[PDB]
Design a protein around this nucleic acid. Structure first.
Ligand SMILES: [Mg+2]
Lengths: 216, 493, 279, 226
RNA sequence: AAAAAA
């Protein structure tokens, strides 16, 4: 690519704009900053200059989407809950009109996941709230939250809107979303598995608790 | 059914709104400022257009209250509810008797009744005025254009008018009856100053009166004559004990020095001016009332029923037509067509006269006769929405703006920048040998396993690798747990 | 650098003090600064006795800005939560700004965020004295294209219009709260009161791309004279500013106006001029 | 009497179906029934009576609470100090309304029953039974005086009609009374001296805890104020 | 950071 492949923080990669000559016509390559890069200003020969500079140690990748995107891939931080993403959460508390949780991991894109490492005994972990209307598409008005989720149960959901900078708004309306892993009696009993979409049973003690289950 | 009083009125209703609201005030008693000076029009600002100002605006602010409202007097117990009887006034012969009866009183308690279902602007139905020793029920239907003579009492600063939530009462007074209030004392604002839990009228009749009442007849039709027993019970109950509460609240305010604030907010209520939706100020305020305070009233209708910004032209015509008929036959917009039924016209969009008549639960009378026209407005709106139906472009003009050979210049200045910067680096090679903690701190993780002899054995680094390979392979594909349950209720074919 | 070294040390208006009986007449209506106790009226603060009509009160010598309905004020966003904005107008409490009290064009932090200045009107008042702000106007909105300066709230009196245009192509926004904003005269500022007798860029954070030095030093000088008039405890009006701006032209450099002897000179010049041509 | 200790074997055979209750615990894994408290096992129905000063939310229980907060959705009422708050809805009152809200300030005494009480959810009460003529004394308790007692003294007073308290107090004075299952007793009389006489009796009766000492205490208390 | 009339 006529540009350095390996880049340490502070290493010059490519100028602001670029162009080449092919097929008897000038093709304009537009370089734009990305994750790991930062467009800054340098001075030389008594004249200002703007060039793409890597800010993270790793390899440079030049890709195009249907313009040249310059980004640096390290050998987590970039991953952050955005509208449409699927996120594994754990129920922290149950209220009557809603159910608040905390974000643990986020599903990637083509399964693999991105685990967000944080202290659960502090509160530094991202918190999210699942509305009672976002529990299931069936009968959106009247939904008993006690018979859907449970403190400690793992819930796979999808984030709708970020809202403010405190809580995320999730939903379990579709089939592949709902309580995934759970135990009997708030975790006191044995492991339970998902059979019906609105019923969770335990093939060990024969206990059956009402939850919101996803599709296997 | 019930005959509307609009036909029985001496003057026909006018829903044209072609001219700014002109007060029906003919005689202006207790006024230090001439009527001719207040009958003019205010200069048009940016937000405020040309309109007639409040007649007693100069009288409300400038005039002083009676010095007996500023002193703490003992409460005056209300007359017995069972012993006292309400006096009905349906003729002008007994209206004059009440007028001279109110002039010898220190304070009066007045509350209105309104019906906005069979009229566009709405019509004042019942006015209940109560003194210390008697109660009155004034009919505002038959006696309407002759109630302007009550302004001698209502605009007199010597007599204290006791209302509750007069924010809508002052409007109804000046619009239909042409009445104005000078020297108002709103018990509602008084309740706010004390910090009472509920600023309603039912709470004041409970805590400071111990007369249990309830909200039963409010939206109910008051045009029905004569008045029934539970309705006339609620009618007189509003202003009966109101004078008792007036003293009790007035004593609360003086000792807490909050009386100045209540009378202040009361005057601002009394100076409220009514104006049509067309000639309303462009800036929303609480001093001017209008049926529609938004330039685009169809906006909030769409966002409520989640209507996308595409059928706005459809809901506009349906709204403007609903307002046109309502101002024609002199009816309420909801009586012509409810918002729920209008939503069915926007959501389903019936192209024929068959789909218009049958929607949801029921259909009103106004849109039933004009159902054929409604089928055309939908066909016109759908025709309109189908009639109407920059990323690299904005960048491309900027790339042709900057010089092309300059790109070769900034590249040469970039190549000469790197070669004169990072290309020059020379220093004697120094080993990374540990000085102190560099030997032990970054130590690779080792594991040991004690055998039967008790001798330490270093676990191979390859041993743990195949352990992870065995775990990750077994965890990735879990064996499906199969368990059978007996079903004696099922049978074969 | 200027220093001051001192060693050894560190129809009449009635002046009342807390606890003093102002009048023995219970007829009067109790106002601010006075409390009621057994038909007697005592003063709670120290100041002048204000007798207006039936209302009796005591005006304090010094006090924070008291918000009134219709006041044109300049405020800064203090915090943003739920569906409201709480703006600091330098009062006793933070004024509130509802979501329905602003202009929505066709995540509230994308419109107004902490730190942003704005000018607004007091729509109404709460029971605790807090003010409800209202920005729905062509004269109100988010502030930019200039600089902020603060003067005592008792130096700016109410008026029909608080936005004045001044020579030098700049515009002042005299808030009743004392918060003042100087800015470059825009299209709205040039023709505002005149056309009356004849929208995503309103929340923008970026100033005008072309700010001439002639305007920057004007904004600068206009700021130095206002704080100078405030230094002499002189009520700031549109005329007092223009006069001070012209009277300060005898000083070539703008930086010379920061001195104490210079500020009191410009202040005394206007006081003596308005007294001479006023009588 | 048969005294029970936690962890001890359960005398009742697992063969015959027996309904559970308070005092016993069903192990979510081993599925064995064991006692978790100390007291007397009552078998008719299987439950254990144990001494406790702290009340826990439970369905169909009459409680006397104090309004500690007023929200827009419901009321915040504390049935006991330091315990979690309870949710009293606006529609939980007789003759309910939409726009119009019932008149209750912070500190008002309310006599209501617990409708829905989950262990992992905020409890809820209603000021109208479901139902007993809508009037079991439910509603705002005007004036009067309340007294804190243990849960043992409260339940036996409300349920058991052989308890010589309301029987012995009715002879000394005429009054209306309301007893909650959270250890709260509300008693209102005409004269203040009578209410004070009733407060001192229950205070001493709960302390000594003797069935035959009720008449003795009540005699000397009412003659003390005079 | 709900509230008042009808
Ligand atoms: Mg009323």
């Amino acid at each position: 690519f006529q540009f350095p492949e390996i880049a340490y923080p502070g290493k010059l990669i490519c100028p602001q704009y670029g162009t080449e000559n092919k097929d008897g016509e000038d093709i304009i390559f537009n370089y734009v900053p990305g994750p790991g890069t930062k467009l800054i200003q340098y001075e030389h020969n008594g004249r200002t200059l703007e060039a793409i500079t890597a800010t993270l140690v790793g390899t440079v990748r030049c890709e195009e989407e249907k313009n040249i995107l310059v980004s640096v891939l390290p050998g987590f931080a970039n991953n952050l809950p955005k509208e449409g993403d699927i996120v594994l959460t754990r129920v922290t508390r149950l209220s009557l009109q809603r159910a608040n949780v905390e974000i643990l991991a986020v599903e990637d894109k083509p399964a693999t996941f991105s685990v967000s490492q944080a202290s659960s005994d502090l509160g530094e972990t991202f918190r999210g709230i699942i509305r009672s209307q976002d529990v299931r598409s069936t009968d959106r008005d009247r939904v008993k939250v006690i018979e859907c989720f449970k403190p400690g149960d793992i819930v796979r959901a999808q984030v709708l809107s970020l809202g403010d900078g405190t809580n995320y708004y999730l939903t379990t309306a579709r089939n592949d979303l709902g309580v995934v892993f759970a135990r009997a009696a708030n975790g006191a009993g044995g492991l339970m598995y998902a059979t019906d979409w609105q019923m969770m049973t335990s093939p060990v003690t024969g206990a059956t608790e009402k939850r919101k289950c996803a599709k296997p | 059914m019930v005959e509307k009083p609009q036909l029985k009125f001496k003057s026909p209703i006018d829903n044209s709104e072609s001219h700014p609201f002109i007060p029906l005030l003919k005689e202006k008693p207790n006024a230090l400022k001439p009527l001719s000076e207040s009958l003019r029009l205010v200069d048009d600002d940016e937000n405020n257009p040309s309109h007639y100002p409040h007649p007693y605006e100069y009288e409300i602010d400038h005039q002083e209250y009676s010095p007996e409202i500023l002193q703490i007097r003992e409460e005056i117990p209300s007359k017995s509810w069972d012993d006292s009887v309400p006096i009905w006034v349906d003729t002008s012969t007994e209206l004059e008797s009440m007028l001279e009866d109110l002039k010898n009183t220190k304070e009066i308690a007045v509350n209105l009744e309104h019906h906005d279902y069979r009229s566009y602007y709405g019509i004042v139905c019942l006015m209940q005025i109560s003194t210390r020793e008697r109660d009155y029920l004034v009919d505002t239907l038959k006696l309407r254009e002759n109630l302007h003579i009550l302004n001698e009492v209502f605009t007199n600063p010597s007599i204290v008018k006791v209302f509750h939530g007069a924010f809508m009462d002052i409007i109804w007074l000046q619009r239909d009856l042409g009445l104005y209030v000078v020297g108002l004392f709103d018990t509602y604002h008084a309740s706010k100053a004390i910090g009472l839990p509920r600023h309603s009228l039912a709470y004041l009749l409970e805590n400071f009166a111990n007369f249990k009442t309830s909200k039963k007849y409010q939206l109910a039709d008051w045009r029905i004559r004569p008045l029934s027993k539970p309705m006339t019970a609620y009618a007189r109950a509003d202003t009966h004990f109101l004078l008792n509460i007036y003293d009790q609240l007035r004593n609360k305010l003086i000792e807490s020095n909050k009386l100045a604030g209540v009378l202040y907010e009361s005057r601002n209520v009394a100076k409220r001016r009514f104006e049509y939706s067309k000639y309303r100020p462009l800036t929303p305020s609480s001093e001017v009332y209008s049926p529609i305070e938004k330039e685009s009233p169809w906006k909030i209708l769409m966002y409520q029923y989640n209507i996308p910004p595409e059928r706005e032209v459809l809901v506009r015509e349906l709204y403007q037509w609903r307002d046109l008929i309502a101002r024609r036959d002199d009816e309420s917009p909801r009586f012509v067509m409810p918002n729920q039924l209008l939503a069915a016209l926007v959501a389903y969009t019936p192209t024929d006269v068959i789909g218009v008549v049958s929607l949801t639960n029921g259909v009103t009378e106004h849109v039933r006769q004009n159902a054929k026209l409604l089928a055309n407005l939908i066909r016109d709106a759908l025709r309109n929405i189908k009639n109407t139906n920059s990323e690299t472009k904005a960048d491309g003009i900027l790339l042709e703006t900057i010089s092309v050979p300059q790109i070769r210049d900034v590249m040469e200045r970039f190549s000469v920048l790197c070669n004169s910067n990072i290309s020059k680096s020379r220093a004697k090679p120094v080993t990374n040998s540990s000085i102190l903690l560099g030997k032990i701190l970054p130590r690779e993780e080792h594991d040991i396993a004690y055998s039967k002899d008790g001798l330490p054995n270093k676990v191979k680094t390859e041993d743990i690798r195949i352990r992870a390979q065995n775990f990750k392979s077994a965890l990735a594909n879990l064996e499906d747990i199969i368990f059978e349950i007996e079903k004696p209720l099922v049978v074969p074919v | 650098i200027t220093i001051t070294k001192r060693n050894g040390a560190f129809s009449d208006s009635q002046i009342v003090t807390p606890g003093e009986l102002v009048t023995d007449d219970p007829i009067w209506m109790r106002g601010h600064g006075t409390y009621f106790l057994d038909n007697m009226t005592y003063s709670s603060v120290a100041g002048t006795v204000s007798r207006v009509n039936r209302l009796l009160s005591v005006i304090p010598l010094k006090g924070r800005y008291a918000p009134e309905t219709g006041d044109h004020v300049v405020g800064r966003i203090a915090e943003v939560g739920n569906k409201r904005w709480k703006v600091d107008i330098g009062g006793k409490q933070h004024a509130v700004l509802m979501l329905g009290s602003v202009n929505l064009p066709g995540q509230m932090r994308s419109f107004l965020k902490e730190g942003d200045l704005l000018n607004a009107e007091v729509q109404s008042l709460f029971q605790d004295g807090s003010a409800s702000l209202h920005t729905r106007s062509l004269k109100y909105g988010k502030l930019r294209n200039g600089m902020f300066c603060q003067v005592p709230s008792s130096l700016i009196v109410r008026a029909k219009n608080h936005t004045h245009n001044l020579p030098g192509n700049i515009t002042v926004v005299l808030g009743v709260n004392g918060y003042i904003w100087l800015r470059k005269t825009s299209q709205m500022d040039l023709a505002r009161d005149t056309p009356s007798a004849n929208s995503w860029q309103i929340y923008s954070d970026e100033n005008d791309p072309s700010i001439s030095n002639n305007i920057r030093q004007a904004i600068c000088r206009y700021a130095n004279v206002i704080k100078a008039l405030a230094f002499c405890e002189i009520g700031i009006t549109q005329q007092r500013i223009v006069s001070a701006y012209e009277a300060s032209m005898v000083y070539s450099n703008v930086g010379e106006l920061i001195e104490k002897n210079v500020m009191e000179s410009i202040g005394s010049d206007i006081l003596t001029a308005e007294k001479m041509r006023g009588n | 009497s048969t005294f029970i200790f936690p962890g001890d074997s359960f005398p009742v055979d697992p063969t015959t179906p027996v309904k559970l209750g308070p005092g016993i615990y069903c192990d979510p894994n081993t599925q064995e029934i064991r006692p978790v408290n100390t007291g007397v096992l009552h078998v008719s129905t299987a439950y254990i009576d144990y001494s406790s000063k702290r009340y826990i939310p439970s369905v169909n229980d009459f409680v006397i609470g104090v309004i500690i907060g007023t929200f827009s959705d419901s009321y915040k009422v504390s049935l006991q100090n330091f315990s979690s708050s309870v949710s009293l809805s606006y529609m939980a009152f007789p003759n309910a309304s939409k726009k119009n809200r019932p008149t209750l300030q912070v500190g008002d005494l309310v006599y209501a029953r617990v409708c829905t009480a989950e262990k992992e959810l905020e409890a809820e009460i209603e000021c109208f039974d479901s139902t007993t003529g809508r009037d079991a004394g439910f509603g705002i308790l005007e004036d009067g005086m309340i007294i804190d007692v243990n849960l043992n003294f409260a339940r036996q007073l409300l349920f058991n009609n052989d308890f010589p308290l309301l029987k012995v107090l009715a002879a000394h004075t005429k009054f209306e009374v309301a007893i909650g299952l959270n250890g709260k007793i509300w008693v209102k009389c005409e004269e203040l001296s009578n209410t004070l006489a009733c407060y001192r009796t229950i205070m001493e009766c709960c302390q000594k805890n003797d069935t035959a000492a009720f008449k003795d205490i009540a005699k000397r208390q009412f003659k003390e104020i005079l």
